[PDB]
Amino acid sequence: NQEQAIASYEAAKEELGLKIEQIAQEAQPILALVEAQDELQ
Amino acid sequence: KNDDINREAHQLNEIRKKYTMRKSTIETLREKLDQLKREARKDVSQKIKD
Amino acid sequence: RDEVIKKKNQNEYYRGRTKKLTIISTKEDFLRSQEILAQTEKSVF
Amino acid sequence: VKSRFEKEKSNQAEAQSNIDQGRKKVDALNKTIAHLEEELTKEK
Amino acid sequence: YLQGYTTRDCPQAACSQVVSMRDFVRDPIMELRCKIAKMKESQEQDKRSSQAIDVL
Please give the method by which this entry was determined.
Answer: cryo-EM
Q: D29 with A2: CB under 8 angstroms?
A: yes
Q: A32 with D9: CB under 8 angstroms?
A: no
Residue type for position A29: P
B6's CB contacts (< 8 A; 6+ apart) are none
Closest CA in chain D for residue C13 = D14
Task: Quote the CA–CA distance of A31 and E30 in Å, as a whole number.
Answer: 29
Give E54→chain C minimum CA distance, Å. 5
CB contact under 8 A, A23 and D1: yes
CB contact under 8 A, C17 and B15: no
Specify the resolution in Å. 8.0
C32's CB contacts (< 8 A; 6+ apart) are B22, B25, B26
CB contact under 8 A, B32 and D28: yes
D15 touches chain A (CB under 8 A): yes
Helices vs strands, H then E, count in chain D: 1, 0
CB count in 10 Å sphere of residue D5: 17
Task: Quote the CA–CA distance of B25 and B36 in Å, as a whole number.
Answer: 15
CA atoms within 13 A on the CB side of D6: 14
Q: A1 with A9: CB under 8 angstroms?
A: no
